[PDB]
Amino acid sequence: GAMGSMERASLIQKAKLAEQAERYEDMAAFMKGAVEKGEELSCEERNLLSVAYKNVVGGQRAAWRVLSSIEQKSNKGPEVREYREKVETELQGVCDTVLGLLDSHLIKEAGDAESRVFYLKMKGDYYRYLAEVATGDDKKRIIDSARSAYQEAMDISKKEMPPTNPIRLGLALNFSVFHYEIANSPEEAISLAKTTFDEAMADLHTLSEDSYKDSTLIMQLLRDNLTLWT
């Protein structure tokens, strides 16, 4: 990689510069170089990797939706399909980079529960993103790969984290949206969102100072979805 001759601490430093400049492609490239040094990320470094690649694929998905929509209005000429396919291929390239980093460097049996859940949930998210644009046999394997990563994350978080934990709630929220938008299982979507919300309320005594803010916003998103689906 072009980041191999750079110091770990300088790659982290320029990832922060890239963020302040809103240069997410560079932020991602720097954080990828950092991960390749082969040391465990701190919680803060983990968050920078995730922020950087969330912004890259986030922009590409939004661009895919605009084009995918303009294509469907031709209900023709090949231009819109072609351009949608170009953007699609770039999004698949970035998703493969992140899954490659997760499998190669970040997902392990060892390390705290928060890290093992956060990473398995990322794996679920990026397979979810590949599922949105995929077809046929590829699509089936990709949806099985998402559910499976999400499911592993859920087993770790039910065993090792309180029901109020923001990473556990965010895993449930995203898994529940997978069920709804991807796996065509409104029933599993509504059931997960409801048991997630209710279990946090029944164990509210566990809600920490450090999660009060993040867990309360995630609980509102769980509720808002239940209201949209019922």
Partner: peptide, 10 residues
Amino acid sequence: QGLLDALDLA
């Protein structure tokens, strides 16, 4: 900082 943004909520 960043955990909420980092969790890339759907």
